[PDB]
């Protein structure tokens, strides 16, 4: 189906001494494959998926060179933003940046992204057309003017539409054994009595990939959202994901209730019964 490559960058200033803590991570879909951490000893971009270890030393030197430049840009930015927002040197502040590209099932460019946040708030974001900017406030508007004058968007556009997609296609090939594989959820249902008249049915989805999934309950073939609880999809820690959804039912009426599971690893939606 569709695929994406995304990079996430976080810089946190450290008042009192030294440079910001900088952490960069890269993903293909829901799989992390590289990292950089300023606090680590190597000071290299490091592999985090087996299939990227295929890449040779020129890859790692280049990613290292580029990610250190990203780190220095963020360092300067934290100083600039402190100025724009009239903040003191006493507090810790955070810049976050995310960019990347989505492709559809044909692996052709679908969407690009490049956005920035300061202290957890929208600062500036490239618009869907990759030609203009959304500046959240007047500080960001100053950055927008600067980036318009220097034609930043046109250069981002070239990466997001071109280079980014090429990288993604290369990674999808080298990592084909896992990146192009779908893991359908392993499902089952559990039952818990809370009282002599009330029971909880819990529908589990385990070991699935990618993370995107839908669990829904029906009573007598109709959608039921009342008296249901659904947890946020969570990482198992082995690369796959977990989720469950529960409904409270009158004891003895369990058979009315069905759990419905949608996942791209499932040719057809799955139905579970107690």
């Amino acid at each position: 189906g569709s695929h994406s490559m995304r990079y996430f960058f976080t810089s946190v200033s450290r008042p009192g001494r030294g440079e910001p803590r900088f952490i960069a991570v890269g993903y293909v879909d829901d799989t992390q494959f590289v990292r950089f951490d300023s606090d680590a000893a190597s000071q290299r971009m490091e592999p985090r998926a087996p299939w990227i270890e295929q890449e040779g030393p020129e890859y790692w030197d280049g990613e290292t060179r580029k990610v250190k430049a990203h780190s220095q840009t963020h360092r300067v930015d934290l100083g600039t933003l402190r100025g724009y927002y009239n903040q003191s040197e006493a507090g810790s502040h955070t810049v976050q940046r995310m960019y990347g590209c989505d492709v559809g099932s044909d692996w052709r460019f679908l969407r690009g992204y490049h956005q920035y946040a300061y202290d957890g708030k929208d600062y500036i974001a490239l618009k869907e057309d990759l030609r203009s900017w959304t500046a959240a406030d007047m500080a960001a508007q100053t950055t927008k003017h600067k980036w318009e004058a220097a034609h930043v968007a046109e250069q981002l556009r070239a990466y997001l539409e071109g280079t980014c997609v090429e990288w993604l296609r290369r990674y999808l090939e080298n990592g084909k054994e896992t990146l192009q594989r779908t893991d359908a959820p392993k499902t089952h249902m559990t039952h818990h009595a809370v009282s002599d008249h009330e029971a909880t049915l819990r529908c589990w989805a385990l070991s699935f990939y990618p993370a995107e999934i839908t669990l829904t309950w029906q009573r007598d073939g109709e959608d039921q959202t009342q008296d249901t609880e659904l947890v946020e999809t969570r990482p198992a820690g082995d690369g796959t994901f977990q989720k469950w959804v529960a409904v409270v039912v009158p004891s003895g009426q369990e058979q009315r209730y069905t759990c419905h599971v949608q996942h791209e690893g499932l040719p057809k939606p799955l139905t579970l019964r107690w």
């Binding site: 990079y7 960069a24 890269g26 890859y59 280049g62 990613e63 580029k66 990610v67 430049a69 990203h70 840009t73 300067v76 930015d77 600039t80 933003l81 960019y99 920035y116 600062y123 500036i124 950055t143 600067k146 980036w147 220097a150 930043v152 250069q155 981002l156 990466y159 280079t163 980014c164 990288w167």
Partner: peptide, 9 residues
Amino acid sequence: GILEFVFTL
């Protein structure tokens, strides 16, 4: 692969 060039805000 990440961006070759970055820009300060």
